[PDB]
Design an enzyme around this catalytic site. Structure first.
Site, mmCIF file in Angstrom:
data_model
loop_
_atom_site.group_PDB
_atom_site.id
_atom_site.type_symbol
_atom_site.label_atom_id
_atom_site.label_comp_id
_atom_site.label_asym_id
_atom_site.label_seq_id
_atom_site.Cartn_x
_atom_site.Cartn_y
_atom_site.Cartn_z
ATOM 1 N N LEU B 51 0.853 -1.180 0.000
ATOM 2 C CA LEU B 51 0.000 0.000 0.000
ATOM 3 C C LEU B 51 0.896 1.238 0.000
ATOM 4 O O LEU B 51 0.695 2.173 -0.791
ATOM 5 C CB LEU B 51 -0.965 0.003 1.180
ATOM 6 C CG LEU B 51 -1.872 1.231 1.323
ATOM 7 C CD1 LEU B 51 -2.883 1.332 0.183
ATOM 8 C CD2 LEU B 51 -2.589 1.234 2.668
ATOM 9 N N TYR B 52 1.901 1.239 0.885
ATOM 10 C CA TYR B 52 2.843 2.342 0.898
ATOM 11 C C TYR B 52 4.182 1.887 1.462
ATOM 12 O O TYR B 52 4.302 0.855 2.127
ATOM 13 C CB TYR B 52 2.283 3.525 1.686
ATOM 14 C CG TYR B 52 1.943 3.273 3.151
ATOM 15 C CD1 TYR B 52 0.743 2.677 3.513
ATOM 16 C CD2 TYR B 52 2.801 3.667 4.178
ATOM 17 C CE1 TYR B 52 0.409 2.470 4.845
ATOM 18 C CE2 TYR B 52 2.482 3.454 5.512
ATOM 19 C CZ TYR B 52 1.278 2.861 5.850
ATOM 20 O OH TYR B 52 0.929 2.622 7.144
ATOM 21 N N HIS B 133 -4.683 -2.680 -2.683
ATOM 22 C CA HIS B 133 -4.611 -3.612 -1.570
ATOM 23 C C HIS B 133 -4.053 -4.953 -2.040
ATOM 24 O O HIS B 133 -4.153 -5.950 -1.328
ATOM 25 C CB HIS B 133 -5.984 -3.788 -0.910
ATOM 26 C CG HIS B 133 -6.243 -2.903 0.267
ATOM 27 N ND1 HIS B 133 -5.501 -2.975 1.429
ATOM 28 C CD2 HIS B 133 -7.157 -1.937 0.452
ATOM 29 C CE1 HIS B 133 -5.967 -2.083 2.288
ATOM 30 N NE2 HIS B 133 -6.976 -1.439 1.719
ATOM 31 N N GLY B 147 -0.008 -8.650 5.034
ATOM 32 C CA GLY B 147 -0.870 -7.486 4.924
ATOM 33 C C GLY B 147 -0.110 -6.182 5.156
ATOM 34 O O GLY B 147 -0.660 -5.107 4.908
ATOM 35 N N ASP B 164 0.603 -8.050 12.159
ATOM 36 C CA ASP B 164 0.088 -8.584 10.909
ATOM 37 C C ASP B 164 0.465 -10.065 10.857
ATOM 38 O O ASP B 164 0.917 -10.616 11.862
ATOM 39 C CB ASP B 164 0.566 -7.752 9.724
ATOM 40 C CG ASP B 164 -0.358 -7.717 8.510
ATOM 41 O OD1 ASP B 164 -0.725 -8.812 7.997
ATOM 42 O OD2 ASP B 164 -0.722 -6.595 8.089
ATOM 43 N N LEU B 318 -16.839 3.408 16.240
ATOM 44 C CA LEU B 318 -17.839 2.962 15.284
ATOM 45 C C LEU B 318 -17.684 1.465 15.013
ATOM 46 O O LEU B 318 -18.677 0.759 14.861
ATOM 47 C CB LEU B 318 -17.778 3.782 13.996
ATOM 48 C CG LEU B 318 -18.129 5.269 14.131
ATOM 49 C CD1 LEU B 318 -17.848 6.023 12.851
ATOM 50 C CD2 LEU B 318 -19.579 5.470 14.510
ATOM 51 N N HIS B 352 -3.671 -5.559 13.009
ATOM 52 C CA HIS B 352 -3.897 -5.550 11.575
ATOM 53 C C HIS B 352 -3.935 -6.971 11.011
ATOM 54 O O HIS B 352 -3.432 -7.200 9.918
ATOM 55 C CB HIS B 352 -2.812 -4.709 10.904
ATOM 56 C CG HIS B 352 -3.200 -4.195 9.558
ATOM 57 N ND1 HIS B 352 -2.508 -4.503 8.402
ATOM 58 C CD2 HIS B 352 -4.227 -3.428 9.186
ATOM 59 C CE1 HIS B 352 -3.093 -3.911 7.374
ATOM 60 N NE2 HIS B 352 -4.146 -3.268 7.828
ATOM 61 N N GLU B 380 -7.820 -6.288 -4.519
ATOM 62 C CA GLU B 380 -7.506 -7.190 -3.423
ATOM 63 C C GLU B 380 -6.865 -8.448 -3.994
ATOM 64 O O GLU B 380 -7.081 -8.764 -5.163
ATOM 65 C CB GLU B 380 -8.806 -7.558 -2.704
ATOM 66 C CG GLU B 380 -9.453 -6.399 -1.954
ATOM 67 C CD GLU B 380 -8.696 -5.951 -0.712
ATOM 68 O OE1 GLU B 380 -9.054 -4.890 -0.145
ATOM 69 O OE2 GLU B 380 -7.750 -6.674 -0.300
ATOM 70 N N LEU B 446 -15.478 3.139 4.565
ATOM 71 C CA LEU B 446 -14.381 2.691 5.414
ATOM 72 C C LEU B 446 -14.885 1.553 6.322
ATOM 73 O O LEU B 446 -15.730 1.843 7.195
ATOM 74 C CB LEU B 446 -13.802 3.848 6.240
ATOM 75 C CG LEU B 446 -12.580 4.582 5.671
ATOM 76 C CD1 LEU B 446 -12.350 5.854 6.494
ATOM 77 C CD2 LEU B 446 -11.298 3.740 5.690
#
Lengths: 441, 446, 439
Positions: B51-52, B133, B147, B164, B318, B352, B380, B446
């Site tokens: 991802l980065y 991803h 991941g 991970d 949330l 994660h 993915e 999200l």
């Protein structure tokens, strides 16, 4: 270390070398007619005529007869004519019907006329590819072949005319046409009396259009950025290489950008570029037709028709633009020219970047050309100013029939327009259809 | 006589795999060291998809090791692919500064002669509508699959970590398939652009390229012929974008094949309804379901209650509300010891974990967060390990042992805090959101 | 790469877990392992051996088979032995297999006789393998008192258990189709079994079918990981024979060979000499004449067959004679195994630390042309079996003398008188050369 992304784009374009002696400008539609006929007579290997249309009129007949005649005298000559599929099949008695008669009245002589459909309906894509490929030369104009484009019979349609002798480029263009168009799905002969109707080939055209979406010239550059070069370009849709080059070209103006377009209707992105140039202190010249030099313009004495509102809509575009940039008009940075010569019509396209780049194209620089139509160009890089005599002579004559617009108020407002026009336009702007119209024409 | 779900799995193409060529690692530090080791010893190719890759000590370590390996073997084929949009911004809310892409440019200038290209993949025109991803470090004939992105915490530089999962799989055919798929579909795809170029385009300029690219990706899948039956250890690489991808279908069919128990890891509890329905069917059939998620405090957006609260620090809450709502409805199954929910928590380290265990026979390792975003928007991928002979049993069990070690079992939905128990700013924000029904939208993006 | 390494690189190879390879080092352990695996078998037991003897050792095994089939009647139990060998004494078992079947009604343990040729001297079943579920217990051993170390005297062989679904399937399936369902295979537990002449034509057609029967399977493993490759062959151009030929030159350091009867074909000798010339090492482990099962103590009445150990010694001495230079440079090492009056039956090939051929192949002209042979080729490029490989070689060598000089081996002059006369008679008429091609 490096230059800005715009110059980088241009620096890294593949470029074909070009001799100054092998570039000939012509300055008038009549010369263009005669040059075309001359090159048809003297052709030895191939003639590939791509045009929007070839009309069943004196002008068009002249050309088709010259093609049949050259093929009769040299049966080994490879003669092909490609026009727009949809345009050739509409006004009563159509061009396609005429192409059929011609083929029957000239048995033994093989002059195939193919119809290219760029989309399933004309309004969603037309063949704006341009090029007469004759042996090792390309005679490149925006002109279709009819009375006015060829200045048969005393009234003319002003375009630009360049003959470029270059083996490699003509090969690249001839070969690209062969593989992608002529042998493409859904291309169909118009000289066949049994040619399909559009609905029957609808699915072929859809697949064809997708094939075209990433068809591009593939060739290795043989020339650096210190010598006279030509770069053929072709494109369909927003992310074509042509469109990218047009976008990057404009910011490279260190001094001045010049644009010709028949219908003033620039996409927003090109307008933003223009405004940036003006802000950077550069110069921008825009040469368009007066409303009366538009081919849809209907004199105010004659019966008004719906289509005769287009020249007015293009004027409204120009007046809105000028309005916002009047400051730059006053500083002699922004120069807008209106071409007008009695009731002759204006069809100039192109782009000059300083004295170094010249885009010659069929591209009307409008949203239609940017998404819908199959467009092409040649990009001339002249870093040594070798074409300066001809470039300057061409611009001289283009400007000759022009007025400079010194104030947006010098353009008529909607209030000044004839009554039927005025009512139509007010109706259109009420429901916001003016914005849609500007994206499809 | 087999149900449609088992049929789907039986007919998956499968690549054979030696038990000796599958190595698990159990801690982010081991993963760091393994990555560095494999970079040093690489002989043919290094393809790093993440991802980065962050401009921090951890990320520097990796990029320097890449430059160093390319210097010592200039014939080595080194590529780095990261998300286009993520590489060209700070982390969320932090003071906009020097981006990763700016840093990738400096690195390339400070190391002339040494060719380590960094490509940005845009999965959609805007980050919120698609991110890269895809996961995989492809090194010669191996894939080191995690991941993890590459930064301080993922690599356990400097004392704080992000948990991970880490699997090295030596397999010529699979690595070839994945390397080749990346080459053709991503690297040579429209709208992929170098991030180490100072003159890289801006997103709007390539907007149309990205649209066409995304459509190309919508049906890009691995194509290869299965060489392995369902009686032997196998691996099946999977890749997908959008609702009807082969990955998504396999995830869907996988869950009902649990004859005994299904285990799920997800960082953010936010399952799509279709996967929830599957879970409920399993519970009804009398099977077992284990769900391992992070405590709110193990979420990377969680802001300690002493510090100044920020809007983004509402996300962990949330996700807790989602978990509590779910548990609430299935408390019966908790009581029968069928449904087991675990909360991971280890001081202020972050969670994660992703994956899926089907009995003792299937192991999905993936980057897939199993949320609506991953189901429709993001690119993915996964590897599906079929172990019908229980050959990985020692490692499978050791991995689950250590995952569970920092977990509490939730025996009652009431053991989870309710909105009433939350800090005041949080409480007000959430009530405001639920008033206008935005909570439902948030859970889909999200 | 040279053509030899290329041959090996391109062999199909089945992957193998290090945990699923178990060595055993002594015939008694092998007996117990066989019994254990018979008890715990759940799906199938396929016993292929040269013979299964009507003695305490063999009874033990056959009884364990009947017992396992009684306790699990769904179990697929088969025994395959040599057709001709089972129907004679040593220089019958089939009669005994018949009694067993009658004394155990309801319990289905079929014993098939495989004839590899119309007469024993022209082909025997040297296929090896006990296939039990997903494992193969692979030894050169037949099933009798000495092979199983019943009753205090033993016959030394090698013993490897390899758990591998795919390989065992390939071998089980190959046996099913080519042997069990082959022409001229006939039950030995049938009292009405045909006599050899009656099936003579069946055997001829069978043998031709076998001449190009080979394992067919797709390789799943590269040359950087632990692998096994089953091999099978009959006649000069079998894949086995080709692999044995190509294997030897791949020794970058050392080649080790076990054979019970030193009688190498010329082509394998030429390979050995090439290795020695390239500066590599070659170890050859054979039995002393007294560790041969045909050896007759000099006190007992001499019989014609008791000349074989002497003939094998003459072969060894002739070979060493020609290569004494390489003995002196510590390149060529010849070991004689000997442990009281126990007997030697080691076969195999080690190529460096990387390849291990386990086989029933005696590496003689007979095995090269006449008999149905097989093997497993273990490729261990990562040295994962190193503990076991080294322990096995340790124990093999333990009962060995190194021969430092060909003269340390007795010459014909030193042999007992009846032996000496027999051998001189044979060499007069040149029959020694024929004998070495048929035994």
């Amino acid at each position: 270390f490096k230059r800005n992304k715009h110059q980088q784009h241009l620096a890294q374009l593949p470029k074909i070398s070009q001799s100054v002696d092998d570039v000939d400008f012509f300055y008038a539609p009549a010369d263009f007619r005669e040059t075309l006929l001359e090159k048809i007579a003297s052709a030895k290997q191939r003639i590939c005529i791509v045009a929007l249309y070839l009309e069943q009129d004196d002008g068009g007949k002249g050309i088709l007869n010259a093609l049949y005649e050259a093929k009769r005298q040299r049966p080994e000559l490879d003669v092909r004519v490609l026009v727009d599929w949809h345009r050739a099949q509409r006004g009563s008695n159509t061009n396609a019907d005429w192409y059929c008669r011609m083929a029957q009245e000239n048995p033994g002589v093989d002059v195939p006329v193919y119809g290219v459909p760029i989309n399933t309906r004309e309004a969603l894509g037309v063949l704006h590819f341009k090029g007469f490929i004759i042996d090792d030369s390309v005679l490149y104009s925006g002109a279709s072949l009819n009375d006015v484009y060829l200045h048969q019979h005393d009234k003319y349609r002003y375009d630009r005319y360049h003959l470029i002798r270059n083996r490699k480029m003509s090969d690249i263009m001839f070969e690209w046409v062969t593989q992608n168009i002529m042998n493409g799905r859904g291309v169909n002969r118009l000289d066949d009396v049994n040619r399909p109707k559009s609905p029957e080939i609808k699915n072929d055209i859809r697949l064809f259009r997708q094939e075209l979406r990433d068809a591009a010239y593939h060739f290795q550059g043989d020339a650096d950025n210190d010598q006279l070069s030509v770069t053929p370009l072709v494109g369909l849709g927003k992310s074509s290489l042509l469109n990218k080059t047009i976008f990057h070209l404009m910011p490279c103006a260190e001094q001045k950008l010049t644009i010709c377009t028949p219908y003033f209707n620039l996409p927003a992105i090109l307008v933003r570029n223009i405004i940036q140039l003006l802000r950077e202190g550069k110069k921008v010249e825009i040469i368009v037709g007066d409303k009366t030099a538009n081919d849809f313009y209907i004199p105010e004495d004659e019966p008004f028709k719906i289509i005769g509102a287009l020249p007015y809509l293009y004027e409204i575009n120009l007046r809105r633009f000028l309005s916002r940039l009047q400051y730059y008009v006053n500083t002699d940075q922004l120069v807008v020219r209106l071409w007008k010569d009695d009731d002759n019509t204006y069809h100039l396209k192109g782009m000059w970047v300083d004295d170094k780049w010249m885009l010659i194209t069929g591209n009307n620089l409008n949203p239609r050309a940017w998404r819908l139509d199959l467009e092409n160009a040649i990009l001339i890089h002249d870093p040594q100013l070798e074409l300066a005599p001809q470039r300057e002579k061409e611009l001289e004559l283009i400007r000759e029939h022009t007025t400079i617009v010194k104030h947006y108020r010098d353009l008529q407002s909607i209030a000044d327009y004839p009554v039927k026009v005025r009512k139509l336009i007010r109706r259109l702007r009420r429901i916001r259809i003016d914005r849609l119209i500007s994206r499809i024409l």
